[PDB]
Design a protein around this ligand. Structure first.
Ligand SMILES: Nc1ncnc2c1ncn2[C@@H]1O[C@H](COP(=O)(O)OP(=O)(O)O)[C@@H](O)[C@H]1O
Ligand SMILES: Nc1ncnc2c1ncn2[C@@H]1O[C@H](COP(=O)(O)OP(=O)(O)O)[C@@H](O)[C@H]1O
Lengths: 79, 79
């Protein structure tokens, strides 16, 4: 209850809100793979890696729901 | 000389010709990364790998010319 109250208060003081289904994370992955070709130096291999690694989060979250993760990941990204 | 003659004959009987600077290979890599999202199944991870592996050829060829390969690869792909 005190944790829930604090959670709500942090919403109140943000005034804004986001989804949580890992979908915030996947959308970040889609902005990143469009920013990285503008930088183009050796640094590019680092940003492409970062996007792939944060896409690596929901791949774990699905595995705790017992789904076969790779197949659900590709289906999700396709949608 | 007999190898050169045979090389020419294979051109004559093709009637068509291509560059050789590894650039044929890099252009294939650019078609592939545009075909793969249409397939979309788990098979996608295999085609993206294939494109990355054939892009892995000229990375070796530059190393036999002593250049630092990664930097020349990124510069080439950017061009
Ligand atoms: N019921 C749920 N359905 C889907 N995603 C959830 C659910 N509960 C939590 N999440 C997601 O799990 C992550 C939060 O992990 P969690 O262990 O709950 O953190 P905390 O322990 O700090 O609450 C976020 O991606 C959140 O949106
Ligand atoms: N002088 C060169 N400059 C650039 N690329 C070259 C040159 N000579 C060969 N290549 C490339 O090297 C590859 C051919 O490798 P090579 O060892 O010559 O095969 P082979 O021994 O059968 O002739 C192709 O990509 C070809 O275009």
């Amino acid at each position: 209850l005190r944790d829930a109250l604090g959670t709500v208060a942090d919403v109140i003081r943000d005034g804004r809100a986001v989804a949580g289904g890992g979908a915030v994370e996947i959308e970040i992955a889609k902005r990143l793979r469009k920013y990285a070709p503008q930088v183009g130096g050796k640094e590019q291999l680092a940003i492409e890696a970062y996007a792939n690694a944060i896409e690596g989060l929901i791949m774990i979250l699905a595995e705790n729901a017992g789904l076969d993760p790779i197949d659900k990941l590709m289906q999700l990204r396709s949608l």
